[PDB]
Copies of this chain bind each other. A is one copy, B any other.
């Protein structure tokens, strides 16, 4: 199929582009490079084994979006582009609402214009809000995200939903991601955050590479087995595979298809640190700090629905996630070149 992948040069997108190309789809990447570098492109094509076309630009430019859609006779769009720094979203809300809400709105508006009616959206478990019921199941009604970031994600799911209702021929997948981690097995592609990483695995990786002193474990008095926060981590490669499958099987299947994409099990901060210590050959330094604001104690996904309906489940393990991350970190300590 002909697929426009917005945000395709980013962490999740890049990996999905590789898998998509491997499956012989024709890929057009649209990215504004605010959070990635063009240097990943050649790696995508090399690992993907096929050339993806790149367009530098912004989802907020509806005229441009429409043109690209027509120009490349796109059949489906996978929308990864947007801003995702939680803390920053609290500090700079407008930028999050503009990039994510308006951003998606302009993009689907262009779709409408170009008659494209297959969409896949990067959503998040944040949409479940403060749910005491765990694991989270797609049948639960959504809650109230606590950051502008989370809210922006739920707002898009809602706009997408109403759109589908008004244009019943569209197929729209709402893919709720849990905690993505890991890197391509070759060690040549991975997450390349700039500055202080906000997430656990890259932070740990930077501590391990010798960039940072110690990992601050936010909180150690949670009502969990070891006192540390519990989440569901999923390898970026499994996530990527899930996007290809969802794109392939839901195309032209009218409806709003909501799927949690997770491993279906939780791991605590210590579990993750321990796996990384083992992958890198040395104990990861860390200490306990206070709980981070807005942090829930424990949650993971119920991913039976996607197993049942899409025949998709994760196949990589936590140890792989850590190993693969270390291999990339270690092979490319400066990330992608400028």
Query: Chain A residues in contact with chain B, CB under 8 A?
Result: 90-94, 97-98, 101-102, 105, 108-109, 112, 148, 151, 155, 158-159, 162-163, 165-166
Contact = CB atoms under 8 A, between A and B. Distances in A.
Contacts of A166: 90-94
Most buried by B among A92, A98, A108, A159: A159
A315 B93 CA distance: 39
B90 A108 contact: no
For the complex formed by this chain, how many copies does it contain in all?
2
15 contacts: A90-B165, A90-B166, A91-B166, A94-B108, A94-B109, A94-B166, A97-B101, A97-B105, A97-B159, A98-B105, A98-B109, A101-B101, A101-B102, A148-B159, A151-B158
A94 B159 CA distance: 8
Nearest to A109: B94
A12 to B, nearest CB: 25
Chain A at the B interface: SS class: helix
A181 B148 CA distance: 35
Contacts of A109: 94, 98
Contacts of A92: 166
A107 B80 CA distance: 26
Contacts of A158: 151
A112 to B, nearest CB: 7
Nearest to A142: B144
Contacts of A91: 166
A142 to B, nearest CB: 9
Contact of A93 (B148, B151, B155, B162): B162
Nearest to A62: B98
A92 to B, nearest CB: 7
Closest 8 CB pairs of A and B: A93-B162, A148-B162, A102-B102, A97-B159, A93-B166, A155-B155, A93-B163, A94-B109
A92 B165 CA distance: 10
Nearest to A155: B155
